[PDB]
Ligand binder design. Structure first.
Ligand SMILES: CC(C)CN(C[C@@H](O)[C@H](Cc1ccccc1)NC(=O)c1cccc(O)c1)S(=O)(=O)c1ccc2ncsc2c1
Lengths: 99, 99
């Protein structure tokens, strides 16, 4: 689809059979989800945002379906203010900026 | 134009006699610029993201040129690590997400 920006670009995602709302976030390098359980090994990671750095858990090769489009890649889990889909998965689903 | 997201969507913006590189950021409600001594009235504000909150100064009705497209609107000025063009201005230059 084409998504305008007068409202937050929130989309439904499907991850581990669970539905969540997440923000399509072109300013984010990474995909970062609020606290949740995911299966498998994770690695401790630190990332930086506007307010400083936080600790996250890094899960690799996680399937997520974003607004009906399939991605498999890195998902970080931690104290993000909102679920965000970043460029690592935005590229997988073929998302571009257009004006 | 179409901007892919393999790399950060940085573009050149102009605000007065200052050209700066800024992120086209669909995840940002508001436009946040690195410290600069803009003329005119402003109001204090705090905005939050990954890592917590920062203190910014809100300036209203500031003209900004973004890739040769004219915009005018609210700009938040503060200790952000990157210049961020938010939805308030992305809409004005006709920016959409597409996949
Ligand atoms: C986390 C998001 C919900 C919000 N952030 C926008 C993200 O795209 C930020 C942009 C950014 C900030 C600092 C440095 C670089 C880029 N991106 C990230 O937090 C982010 C960046 C890189 C990696 C990563 O994992 C996350 S934001 O920058 O924190 C932001 C911006 C505008 C705004 N207006 C009102 S509240 C508000 C918050």
């Amino acid at each position: 689809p084409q998504i305008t920006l007068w409202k937050r670009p929130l989309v439904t995602i499907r991850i581990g059979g669970q539905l969540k709302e997440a923000l399509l976030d072109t300013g984010a390098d990474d995909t970062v989800l609020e606290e949740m359980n995911l299966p498998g090994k994770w690695k401790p990671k630190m990332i930086g945002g506007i307010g400083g750095f936080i600790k996250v858990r890094q899960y690799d090769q996680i399937p997520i379906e974003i607004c009906g489009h399939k991605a498999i890649g890195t998902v970080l889990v931690g104290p993000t203010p909102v679920n965000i889909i970043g460029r690592n998965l935005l590229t997988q689903i073929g998302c571009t900026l257009n004006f």
